[PDB]
Amino acid sequence: QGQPAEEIFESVGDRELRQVFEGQNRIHLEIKQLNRQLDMILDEQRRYVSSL
Amino acid sequence: GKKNNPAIVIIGNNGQIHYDHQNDGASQALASCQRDFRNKPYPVRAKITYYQNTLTVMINNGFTPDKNDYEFCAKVENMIIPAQGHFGISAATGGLADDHDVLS
Numbered sequence: 001q002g003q004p005a006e007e008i009f010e011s012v013g014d015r016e017l018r019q020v021f022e023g024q025n026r027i028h029l030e031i032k033q034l035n036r037q038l039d040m041i042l043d044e045q046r047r048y049v050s051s052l
Numbered sequence: 053g054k055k056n057n058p059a060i061v062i063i064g065n066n067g068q069i070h071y072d073h074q075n076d077g078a079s080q081a082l083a084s085c086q087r088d089f090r091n092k093p094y095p096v097r098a099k100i101t102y103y104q105n106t107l108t109v110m111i112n113n114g115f116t117p118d119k120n121d122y123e124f125c126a127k128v129e130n131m132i133i134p135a136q137g138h139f140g141i142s143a144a145t146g147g148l149a150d151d152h153d154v155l156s
Contacts, residue, residue: 003147007148008148015091016093018091019091019092019093019115022088022115023115026113026115
């Protein structure tokens, strides 16, 4: 299989901002949930306005 | 090789299931949540909740200093365990190196 040594090496400052970048990914899924939650709200009342 | 890891794997064994680590125990995996838990600014906190025979896992990410910011990722129901048993913690380090440090 073999294992390269590039995987081991890191700079701490970059790894910290990598965690920050990983922290931004939470907001993405939060936005994605918010969009789909807004999308389903718009569609159901569109049926509800027409049904009314 | 399935990019599941880092992940938290719930496996309940009666003593007859061999844990194969080559698939990282995905075959005998009762439940799992694919979440990174290494290299966090704050220590990672987890909530393990066996209650009414369901085993609920709630995790604090360690990206916040809040202790109670627990988030559900996976669980099982109708879980069977020896009601008399020993709680234990264990960690392994392979060729690649981690420091597994448990604060509380």
